[PDB]
Ligand binder design. Structure first.
Ligand SMILES: Nc1ccc(S(=O)(=O)N(Cc2ccccc2)[C@H]2CNC[C@@H]2N(Cc2ccccc2)S(=O)(=O)c2ccc(N)cc2)cc1
Ligand SMILES: [Cl-]
Ligand SMILES: [Cl-]
Ligand SMILES: [Cl-]
Lengths: 99, 99
């Protein structure tokens, strides 16, 4: 698709068999989802937002579909304001900025 | 331009006679820059994300140049750890997400 930015670029994702809404965020280096259950072991990770750094859970090599496009990569889980697809998976689906 | 997301989409902007580096951020509703002076009236606002919220000053109808493209819009100024170009200005330069 070509997605304009007059509104938030919210899209449907699928992870763990579940559909969710997430924001395509080119400012986010890393994908971060709201609290949920994922398989395997996790590792600690700090991410920095506008108000400082917080600790989230890092799960690697997670299958996730984004607007119908398949990805497998790192998914962080924590108290994000909204589900966010960050540059690590936007690159995988071949997303670019254009003007 | 077509901008890759392998790295942070950092561009040069010109605002208030100043050259600055800023992130093209599709997750940001608003443009938010580190502390600087801008002309005209302003009013306070709070913006937030992971880490919490910060207080900023809101200036309207500010002229900014982004990668050579001129635009007009609201700029927020405050203690952000990164200069952010948000959707309110990305729309004006014709910026889209594409995959
Ligand atoms: N990996 C990663 C890093 C940071 C974050 S975040 O700070 O939560 N976050 C997501 C978000 C917050 C609020 C609403 C919608 C999206 C950031 C990332 N893009 C937009 C948002 N921001 C830009 C940013 C902040 C820190 C580092 C790099 C960029 S922001 O400053 O919080 C912001 C929030 C609200 C408005 N109006 C304008 C700007 C999330 C994941
Ligand atoms: Cl990854
Ligand atoms: Cl505006
Ligand atoms: Cl348009």
């Amino acid at each position: 698709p070509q997605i304009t930015l007059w509104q938030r670029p919210l899209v449907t994702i699928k992870i763990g068999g579940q559909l969710k809404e997430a924001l395509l965020d080119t400012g986010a280096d890393d994908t971060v989802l709201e609290e949920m259950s994922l398989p395997g072991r996790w590792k600690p990770k700090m991410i920095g937002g506008i108000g400082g750094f917080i600790k989230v859970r890092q799960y690697d090599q997670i299958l996730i579909e984004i607007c119908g496009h398949k990805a497998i990569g790192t998914v962080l889980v924590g108290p994000t304001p909204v589900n966010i697809i960050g540059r690590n998976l936007l690159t995988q689906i071949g997303c670019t900025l254009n003007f």
